[PDB]
Write an enzyme that holds these catalytic residues in place. Structure first.
Site, PDB file in Angstrom:
ATOM      1  N   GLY A  58      -0.636  -8.037   3.638  1.00 18.43           N
ATOM      2  CA  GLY A  58       0.702  -9.084   3.234  1.00 18.43           C
ATOM      3  C   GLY A  58       0.574  -9.997   5.046  1.00 18.43           C
ATOM      4  N   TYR A  99      12.525 -18.491   3.578  1.00 19.13           N
ATOM      5  CA  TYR A  99      11.036 -18.614   3.659  1.00 19.13           C
ATOM      6  C   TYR A  99      10.132 -19.343   2.815  1.00 19.13           C
ATOM      7  CZ  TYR A  99       7.205 -14.667   2.597  1.00 19.13           C
ATOM      8  OH  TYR A  99       5.866 -14.242   1.973  1.00 19.13           O
ATOM      9  N   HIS A 100       9.610 -19.910   3.560  1.00 20.19           N
ATOM     10  CA  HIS A 100       8.248 -20.375   2.724  1.00 20.19           C
ATOM     11  C   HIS A 100       8.991 -21.722   2.357  1.00 20.19           C
ATOM     12  CE1 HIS A 100       4.768 -17.449   1.917  1.00 20.19           C
ATOM     13  NE2 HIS A 100       5.069 -17.859   3.944  1.00 20.19           N
ATOM     14  N   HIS A 113      -9.335   2.638   3.905  1.00 20.43           N
ATOM     15  CA  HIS A 113      -8.508   3.805   4.575  1.00 20.43           C
ATOM     16  C   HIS A 113      -8.013   5.106   3.228  1.00 20.43           C
ATOM     17  CE1 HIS A 113      -5.527   6.449   6.503  1.00 20.43           C
ATOM     18  NE2 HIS A 113      -5.973   5.285   8.219  1.00 20.43           N
ATOM     19  N   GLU A 128      -3.263 -17.363   7.529  1.00 19.38           N
ATOM     20  CA  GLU A 128      -2.885 -15.994   6.944  1.00 19.38           C
ATOM     21  C   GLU A 128      -2.450 -16.512   5.687  1.00 19.38           C
ATOM     22  OE1 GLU A 128       0.680 -15.861   6.538  1.00 19.38           O
ATOM     23  OE2 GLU A 128       0.160 -13.308   6.538  1.00 19.38           O
ATOM     24  N   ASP A 135     -12.359   8.814  23.210  1.00 21.14           N
ATOM     25  CA  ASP A 135     -12.839   9.060  22.368  1.00 21.14           C
ATOM     26  C   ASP A 135     -12.791   9.445  20.725  1.00 21.14           C
ATOM     27  OD1 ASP A 135     -14.390   6.858  23.302  1.00 21.14           O
ATOM     28  OD2 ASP A 135     -16.012   7.854  23.821  1.00 21.14           O
ATOM     29  N   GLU A 137     -12.507 -12.924   8.558  1.00 24.05           N
ATOM     30  CA  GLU A 137     -13.072 -13.611   7.937  1.00 24.05           C
ATOM     31  C   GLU A 137     -13.836 -13.194  10.160  1.00 24.05           C
ATOM     32  OE1 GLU A 137     -15.380 -15.375   5.341  1.00 24.05           O
ATOM     33  OE2 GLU A 137     -13.327 -14.320   4.386  1.00 24.05           O
ATOM     34  N   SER A 173      -5.326  21.977  -9.952  1.00 23.21           N
ATOM     35  CA  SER A 173      -4.920  22.458  -8.152  1.00 23.21           C
ATOM     36  C   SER A 173      -4.790  21.844  -7.020  1.00 23.21           C
ATOM     37  CB  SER A 173      -5.811  23.310  -8.330  1.00 23.21           C
ATOM     38  OG  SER A 173      -5.603  24.323  -6.974  1.00 23.21           O
ATOM     39  N   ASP A 197       8.197 -18.874  10.616  1.00 25.36           N
ATOM     40  CA  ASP A 197       7.525 -18.112   9.802  1.00 25.36           C
ATOM     41  C   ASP A 197       5.534 -18.982   9.987  1.00 25.36           C
ATOM     42  OD1 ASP A 197       5.313 -16.135   8.949  1.00 25.36           O
ATOM     43  OD2 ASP A 197       5.684 -16.836   6.497  1.00 25.36           O
TER      44      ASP A 197
HETATM   45  C1  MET Z   1      -1.963 -13.237   1.414  1.00 24.57           C
HETATM   46  S1  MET Z   1      -1.310 -11.948   1.805  1.00 24.57           S
HETATM   47  C2  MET Z   1      -0.137 -12.295   2.309  1.00 24.57           C
HETATM   48  C3  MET Z   1       0.163 -13.921   2.760  1.00 24.57           C
HETATM   49  C4  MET Z   1       1.742 -14.086   3.202  1.00 24.57           C
HETATM   50  N1  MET Z   1       1.599 -13.715   4.598  1.00 24.57           N
HETATM   51  C5  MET Z   1       2.613 -13.944   1.939  1.00 24.57           C
HETATM   52  O1  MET Z   1       3.014 -12.994   1.592  1.00 24.57           O
HETATM   53  O2  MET Z   1       2.354 -15.023   1.527  1.00 24.57           O
HETATM   54 CA   LIG Z   2     -15.933 -13.283   4.199  1.00 21.30          CA
HETATM   55 ZN   LIG Z   3       3.378 -15.428   8.124  1.00 21.05          ZN
HETATM   56 ZN   LIG Z   4       4.021 -16.599   5.372  1.00 20.10          ZN
END
Ligand code: MET
Ligand SMILES: [Ca+2]
Ligand SMILES: [Zn+2]
Ligand SMILES: [Zn+2]
Ligand SMILES: *[C@@H]1O[C@H](CO)[C@@H](O[C@@H]2O[C@H](CO)[C@@H](O[C@@H]3O[C@H](CO)[C@@H](O)[C@H](O[C@H]4O[C@H](CO)[C@@H](O)[C@H](O)[C@@H]4O)[C@@H]3O)[C@H](O)[C@H]2NC(C)=O)[C@H](O)[C@H]1NC(C)=O
Ligand SMILES: *[C@@H]1O[C@H](CO)[C@@H](O[C@@H]2O[C@H](CO)[C@@H](O[C@@H]3O[C@H](CO)[C@@H](O)[C@H](O[C@H]4O[C@H](CO)[C@@H](O)[C@H](O)[C@@H]4O)[C@@H]3O)[C@H](O)[C@H]2NC(C)=O)[C@H](O)[C@H]1NC(C)=O
Ligand SMILES: *[C@@H]1O[C@H](CO)[C@@H](O[C@@H]2O[C@H](CO)[C@@H](O)[C@H](O)[C@H]2NC(C)=O)[C@H](O)[C@H]1NC(C)=O
Ligand SMILES: *[C@@H]1O[C@H](CO)[C@@H](O[C@@H]2O[C@H](CO)[C@@H](O)[C@H](O)[C@H]2NC(C)=O)[C@H](O)[C@H]1NC(C)=O
Ligand SMILES: *[C@@H]1O[C@H](CO)[C@@H](O[C@@H]2O[C@H](CO)[C@@H](O)[C@H](O)[C@H]2NC(C)=O)[C@H](O)[C@H]1NC(C)=O
Ligand SMILES: *[C@@H]1O[C@H](CO)[C@@H](O[C@@H]2O[C@H](CO)[C@@H](O)[C@H](O)[C@H]2NC(C)=O)[C@H](O)[C@H]1NC(C)=O
Ligand SMILES: *[C@@H]1O[C@H](CO)[C@@H](O[C@@H]2O[C@H](CO)[C@@H](O)[C@H](O)[C@H]2NC(C)=O)[C@H](O)[C@H]1NC(C)=O
Ligand SMILES: *[C@@H]1O[C@H](CO)[C@@H](O[C@@H]2O[C@H](CO)[C@@H](O)[C@H](O)[C@H]2NC(C)=O)[C@H](O)[C@H]1NC(C)=O
Ligand SMILES: *[C@@H]1O[C@H](CO)[C@@H](O)[C@H](O)[C@H]1NC(C)=O
Ligand SMILES: *[C@@H]1O[C@H](CO)[C@@H](O)[C@H](O)[C@H]1NC(C)=O
Ligand SMILES: *[C@@H]1O[C@H](CO)[C@@H](O)[C@H](O)[C@H]1NC(C)=O
Ligand SMILES: *[C@@H]1O[C@H](CO)[C@@H](O)[C@H](O)[C@H]1NC(C)=O
Ligand SMILES: *[C@@H]1O[C@H](CO)[C@@H](O)[C@H](O)[C@H]1NC(C)=O
Ligand SMILES: *[C@@H]1O[C@H](CO)[C@@H](O)[C@H](O)[C@H]1NC(C)=O
Ligand code: MET
Ligand SMILES: [Ca+2]
Ligand SMILES: [Cl-]
Ligand SMILES: [Cl-]
Ligand SMILES: [Zn+2]
Ligand SMILES: [Zn+2]
EC number: 3.4.17.21
Lengths: 687, 687
Positions: free
Chosen positions: A460, A489-490, A626, A366, A603, A375, A565, A329
């Site tokens: 995410g 992870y992380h 959405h 991210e 289109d 941004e 309804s 990651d």
């Molecule tokens: C800040 S939304 C997700 C950011 C990152 N991918 C995490 O899951 O920690």
């Molecule tokens: Ca901004």
């Molecule tokens: Zn990532």
């Molecule tokens: Zn990450």
């Protein structure tokens, strides 16, 4: 053509790039990540793209104080600190060199030093708190909460804790969730060691991007909110720990027993809910000194100009910033993107161009809340909304080695089924079989019949602004295992060696994923009629309407009393099916020699995802627009369908003013019905 | 071609249609207006349009109670009603037949019967109240306000009165504003008689449309707000009167003298500000029994399908509902629309089609807050925002007979200058001269140099949703005299005879206006490159930026202290000019034989107005989304440029927390700068 494109992709280039990207940490806002940005920029040029730029932004980031480290303590009556948690993770073999690895911290925690009694809240899901407060009648107000990682986005846990009156949050990884049986801890296996800790931000941004500049790019002249009006900041301190440090903190837990076995991890402890210790007497103390600061970030944007429709954009995007080395990651995704770019560049050099424009992005920050993608999209929203055909994400290529995992809009179901029928499966025991075939056998659709599972898009990751705010058709694809993570992870143990040794020794899974992602992009950028099938939307709309209908039917009496309804929604879904069918016929039956008619129909296909956007947004979440999909309000990682109706129904029995609550349900039905009907009408003949 | 189209338009058909449309009243929601809708629908079919439909909506309307009439009274100590105001206007000669003419009322007034002392507030403009409260230190709280019509939209007057603590509002027409010297009262002249009264709604909708369904069409399954959460309803009763009844009410006014002569009308009275009478003793009593009810309305939508780009819409629209006979307002516009349709239909029958699609609308319930246009645009917003090229309004063709009055987006300046150079002036003493030439001599631009005045678009007519909410390029054109009205506006005396005798005996002004409107529409729907000149936007942006800059410079000290810089806005306006120039060069230099390139460039031209829309809207006015133009917050009829900065600056000296106020100014500069830069970037090369 496409085989040309795909044949050009090599497993060995990917390995090569992965190695290059994971030798030092590339934390957002640091000099090393700027340098990696410049390198990507030079190489995308050499690779052949028409242009490559850096776009920078000054956004709120968050860092531990180097000279005053965060930790947790057990204290006694005399306020002596008996036990302190680790100040860093043991670095893996060979990386004692590492100039500087950021120590585990929760990004955006406020500063503080609360003391109090511990209460254990399982995963700190909404139902966990329901169980605690409603059934066990435990009260977290003024308590320090300890929760294990897993199930749901960590920012949701911290928000639930705040809602519950908690004064601090301690997060830890339980081996129940992060230790796979029969596998060894890193460096001898891919399991999480007791010293390993999961980093990550704990914001509740709901799509806002940079906390200081919601709505607008954080550029040079941006007006910034005061930190007190910032979007999404937690108001209590939070800090993460490994399971060794957690066992110390949990071993003394008093009060109530776990309400049942699902509350119990794998540590040799009772998992009492508390409050407090069995050591009356002793308390817990947090020391958080992390600071928030406005820091510059850099996206790299490359452009491969289209030959025929340069004003139509297909986007392949993925982040470059990492918590530490980012072995999986994001660099396993970034290395795949790099080889895809090299490979498009090769064709281009031999005189080829795609029909539509392809944009390639290396996003920054991210990890800190999808800030770089967001941004950039706030700055270019006018271009994206009128010209954006599709967005393909490219974070982590692998998180397991069992099968393909795809999440996307229904508009891309057929494109993904077709593309994978032309791809060789890389799975043991499916040699000579197609990717579609291994994927379908290993991951069968519940929905039916002989088809692979494809999931809803939540959030995410960097696709969020494109899909949920702007309504641009989006997809993602990766290899996965048979919302919690992979064990490493992380953490610092996410390295190049982790991947080479245990995940993808041959880099054949990276290669499959580079084919799926690159092939999707190729088809989207070059196929003459856009490869979207609107009848796929008609099908899932009906399923989603049945689903939300069944949820409502748990309250027949209220439905009677308030005259609730769903007729208008089913009626809208019926019209969508009908009109969608007819639009497909015309799509088959018209001549591709007429360009204007071709552009018109394209289109329509392009704006169809756009038609599902409500400019007022969803209630309290202005940047989730959405109407069919939104991230779950209980779990940013998960998609929810008909989010506005779902949230109006959620825990409705508890609301004080039933007719007001049911009024709001009906309002959301109306909004959903009208938006489905309006979307369908975009596919009607135009005049 | 165009001459063909224009030659086909006849003065005598217009007169014929005007006569047909003004024989009975066509109040929104009544059976007579439904019948007129069906007739327009049949005739647009015969005229040749490809299709013609009715679109209906159930929206909040407002009517006097037939069996309990509204009026105002003077009361004495014993609560005796000494003087009562009229229950109706004397009908004009020949119309005693009139089955039923609605009596004067303010549409959407709440019910009530307040009594109290009168205070006279001139036009009830914001500055009028400033003068009253600030300088004269008069207090309106608990008072009944009397104001004369004129200067500003009547809904603004009622809102200012509410803000000032007033308990009722009486509106009247002063002969100073509605009696032109040397002209006779109707039926012997076009002046307003003392029995004549101006109808009209007093809502403050700010673009919302139907008060019950903001955001969404008021269709069959719509969820409706409770009237208590309705948008824009006044909270005090209001009622309008003629100057005879007003003289009775004003003749006894005590307290202070008018602060100066601009407060004084033409009635033979002192125009004392009050409060109260000179008759201590006597009070004023209002009797309002009007009701609000959900009532069905009908728009007529006709379609002339384009030959080459059927998915591009040019819209000619105007309302059909009238307060009474609508001799001028709206039937002099509607009759022009009818002849334009007949005339397009003629060409079509001889085998011709325009390049783009033309849509023709006959809107309902304009008089009640632009409800028909708005609900229709809320329903079709996805089509309009992706396919809408331009909107031409068509209310009243004439409101005077002196010269052309045009309001439009800068994108249409050149189209209007060119078109009018090809049109014969119909003015006495300019025979053989062009329309451009009489118009330029009679109505010279202040802005310079040898060019006609063209105004900004505010609101108060059906173009509002298209321009201010959706960002579709809009224009309007009419004959005017040398924000108050013509004397007979919205009274019973607005008849066919009023027009035939005093306004346009030959119907040659109607004809000129039908040429301008029809010619604009023709050029927009058929010209190969869209007739928009983006450099015209660059020019007015610079002027607008100088203007708002000068307004800020009245506060040099605060600009210093808070570091208020306009540099980013001028910089954005500079980039717009530069990029706009280059885009024009490319526009001249590319080959119209390439269709895709032509469509691309047209799309850029089309979306350029769209680029100025902020989806968050302006502060407190979510449905005003255009960052460059909004209706004045002090006068719905008037356009304001850089509305967000202007309102942040307005009366800033009075704000309690200066740095908070100046903070907000700077935020609005940033928003304006960024939006101008983002708009410019849409005209950059696309890849
Ligand atoms: C800040 S939304 C997700 C950011 C990152 N991918 C995490 O899951 O920690
Ligand atoms: Ca901004
Ligand atoms: Zn990532
Ligand atoms: Zn990450
Ligand atoms: C799916 O598409 C269909 C059309 O193919 C669309 O059907 C429409 O349904 C509406 C709402 O039911 C119909 O509305 C009717 O319109 C007629 C005039 O054309 C009116 O006379 C009717 O009103 C009377 O009856 C109402 C209902 O009892 C009363 O409330 C009302 O006061 C009147 O007395 C009625 O409004 C419409 O005509 C059809 N259009 C068709 C069949 O072409 C349907 O709405 C679409 N689904 C969604 C969710 O949009
Ligand atoms: C009108 O168009 C022009 C471009 O034609 C555009 O000019 C841009 O201005 C921005 C903002 O001033 C420039 O930003 C610079 O970017 C460089 C890197 O390329 C940075 O080194 C600079 O940052 C340093 O200096 C800053 C200012 O003192 C410090 O605050 C900062 O901390 C750094 O030390 C600086 O950010 C940008 O490069 C140009 N782009 C060009 C010239 O191509 C202008 O913004 C447009 N107008 C509007 C309103 O958009
Ligand atoms: C990643 O690969 C890049 C590109 O090959 C290496 O950067 C180049 O290396 C040398 C420095 O020894 C220079 O001559 C070039 O200027 C660099 N090119 C760039 C920046 O594009 C880089 O050293 C590699 N990183 C690692 C960790 O091996
Ligand atoms: C946990 O860390 C704290 C902080 O460093 C340790 O307590 C400090 O120890 C030094 C040396 O004894 C004292 O001078 C400071 O007063 C203490 N600081 C605070 C804030 O208490 C403590 O020893 C550690 N606990 C354990 C068991 O190692
Ligand atoms: C996926 O492939 C299927 C099967 O080839 C495609 O469906 C065919 O498309 C062709 C070309 O328009 C039609 O003539 C056939 O009638 C279709 N067959 C079926 C089973 O529908 C489908 O279009 C592809 N989806 C894509 C490429 O997006
Ligand atoms: C306005 O003109 C219309 C259309 O010519 C007249 O309506 C027609 O009149 C007769 C009734 O006498 C019918 O035979 C037709 O069915 C009507 N056509 C329609 C409704 O399209 C109408 O009478 C005129 N109105 C006035 C006041 O003269
Ligand atoms: C103004 O109108 C009011 C209402 O009609 C008149 O007062 C009414 O007169 C009848 C007959 O005298 C009485 O029975 C009612 O009690 C009165 N109604 C009210 C509510 O006062 C009054 O005469 C009119 N004033 C003038 C001068 O004509
Ligand atoms: C209004 O008419 C002017 C003058 O004819 C047009 O400007 C010319 O347009 C032609 C055609 O592209 C160019 O070749 C000339 O160089 C232009 N002359 C000038 C003075 O600019 C202008 O385009 C017209 N505006 C419209 C029709 O929208
Ligand atoms: C880090 O800690 C030091 C003291 O150890 C403190 O004075 C300094 O301000 C901190 N840095 C920050 C808060 O950025
Ligand atoms: C929870 O406990 C705290 C103790 O201070 C109290 O203030 C709060 O009202 C309690 N709330 C509930 C859910 O009973
Ligand atoms: C990859 O290969 C085999 C396939 O079963 C599996 O047993 C092993 O656990 C996988 N590696 C990882 C990291 O999951
Ligand atoms: C009109 O007035 C009558 C009595 O004169 C009243 O009873 C009726 O309800 C009113 N109509 C309404 C309020 O619509
Ligand atoms: C205006 O007068 C009323 C009299 O009741 C009073 O309540 C209110 O506070 C006054 N406000 C001002 C502007 O002095
Ligand atoms: C129309 O014609 C003449 C032109 O001066 C003018 O004097 C007369 O007042 C005009 N009619 C109206 C209604 O303004
Ligand atoms: C309700 S906005 C304006 C409506 C109408 N044209 C009037 O001026 O009274
Ligand atoms: Ca509405
Ligand atoms: Cl991904
Ligand atoms: Cl008009
Ligand atoms: Zn009108
Ligand atoms: Zn009107």
């Amino acid at each position: 053509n496409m085989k040309a494109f795909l044949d050009e992709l090599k497993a060995e280039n990917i390995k090569k790039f992965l190695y290059n990207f994971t030798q030092i940490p590339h934390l957002a806002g640091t000099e090393q990540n700027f340098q990696l940005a410049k390198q990507i920029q030079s190489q995308w040029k050499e690779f052949g793209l028409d242009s490559v730029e850096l776009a920078h932004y000054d956004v709120l980031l968050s860092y531990p104080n180097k000279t005053h480290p965060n930790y947790i303590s057990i204290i006694n009556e005399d306020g002596n600190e008996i036990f302190n948690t680790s100040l860093f993770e043991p670095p893996p073999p060979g990386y004692e060199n590492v100039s500087d690895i950021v120590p585990p911290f929760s990004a955006f925690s406020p500063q503080g030093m609360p003391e109090g009694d511990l209460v254990y809240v399982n995963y700190a899901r909404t139902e966990d708190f329901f169980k605690l407060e409603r059934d066990m009648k435990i009260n977290c107000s003024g308590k320090i909460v300890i929760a294990r990682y897993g199930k749901v986005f960590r920012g949701n846990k911290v928000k639930n804790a705040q809602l519950a009156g908690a004064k601090g949050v301690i997060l830890y990884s339980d081996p129940a969730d992060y230790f796979a049986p029969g596998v060894k801890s890193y460096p001898d296996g891919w399991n999480l060691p007791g010293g390993g800790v999961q980093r990550g931000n704990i914001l509740n941004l709901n799509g806002a991007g940079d906390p200081l500049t919601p709505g607008y790019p954080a550029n040079e002249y941006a007006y910034r909110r005061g930190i007190a009006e910032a979007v999404g900041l937690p108001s209590i301190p939070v800090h993460p720990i490994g399971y060794y440090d957690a066992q110390k903190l949990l071993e003394k837990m008093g009060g109530s027993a776990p309400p049942d076995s699902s509350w119990r991890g794998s540590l040799k402890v009772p998992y009492n809910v508390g409050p407090g210790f069995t050591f009356s007497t002793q308390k817990v103390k947090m020391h958080i000194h992390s600071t928030n600061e406005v820091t510059r970030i850099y996206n790299v944007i490359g452009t491969l100009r289209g030959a025929v429709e340069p004003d139509r954009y297909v986007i392949l995007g993925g982040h470059r910033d990492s918590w530490v080395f980012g072995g999986i990651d994001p660099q396993s995704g970034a290395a795949v993107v790099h080889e895809i770019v090299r490979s498009f560049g090769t064709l281009k050099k031999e005189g080829w161009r795609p029909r539509r424009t392809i944009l390639f992005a290396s996003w920054d920050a991210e990890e800190f809340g999808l800030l770089g993608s967001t941004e950039w999209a706030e700055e270019n929203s006018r271009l994206l909304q009128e010209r954006g055909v599709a967005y393909i994400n490219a974070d982590s290529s692998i998180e397991g080695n069992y099968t393909l995992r795809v999440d996307c809009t229904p508009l891309m179901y057929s494109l993904v089924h077709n593309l994978t029928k032309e791809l060789k499966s890389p799975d043991e025991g499916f040699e000579g079989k197609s990717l579609y075939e291994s994927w379908t056998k290993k991951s069968p659709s519940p929905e039916f019949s002989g088809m692979p599972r494809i999931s809803k898009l939540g959030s995410g990751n960097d696709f969020e602004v494109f899909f949920q705010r702007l309504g641009i058709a989006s997809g993602r694809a990766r290899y996965t295992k048979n919302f919690s993570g992979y064990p490493l992870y992380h953490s610092v143990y996410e390295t190049y060696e982790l991947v080479e040794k245990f995940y993808d020794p041959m880099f054949k899974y990276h290669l499959t994923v580079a084919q799926v992602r690159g092939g999707m992009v190729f088809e989207l950028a070059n196929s003459i009629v856009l490869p979207f099938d609107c009848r796929d939307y008609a099908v899932v709309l009906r399923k989603y309407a049945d689903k939300i209908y069944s949820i409502s039917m748990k309250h027949p009496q209220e439905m009677k009393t308030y005259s609730v309804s769903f007729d208008s929604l089913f009626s809208a879904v019926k019209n969508f099916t009908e009109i969608a069918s007819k639009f497909s016929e015309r799509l088959q039956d018209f001549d591709k020699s007429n360009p204007i008619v071709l552009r018109m129909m394209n289109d329509q296909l392009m704006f169809l995802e756009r038609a599902f956007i409500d400019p007022l947004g969803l209630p309290d979440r202005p940047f989730y627009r959405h109407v069919i999909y939104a991230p779950s309000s209980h779990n940013k990682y998960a998609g929810e369908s008909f989010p506005g109706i779902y949230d109006a129904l959620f825990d409705i029995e508890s609301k004080v003013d039933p007719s007001k609550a049911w009024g709001e349900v009906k309002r959301q039905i109306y909004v959903a019905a009208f938006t489905v009907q309006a979307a369908a009408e975009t596919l009607s003949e135009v005049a």
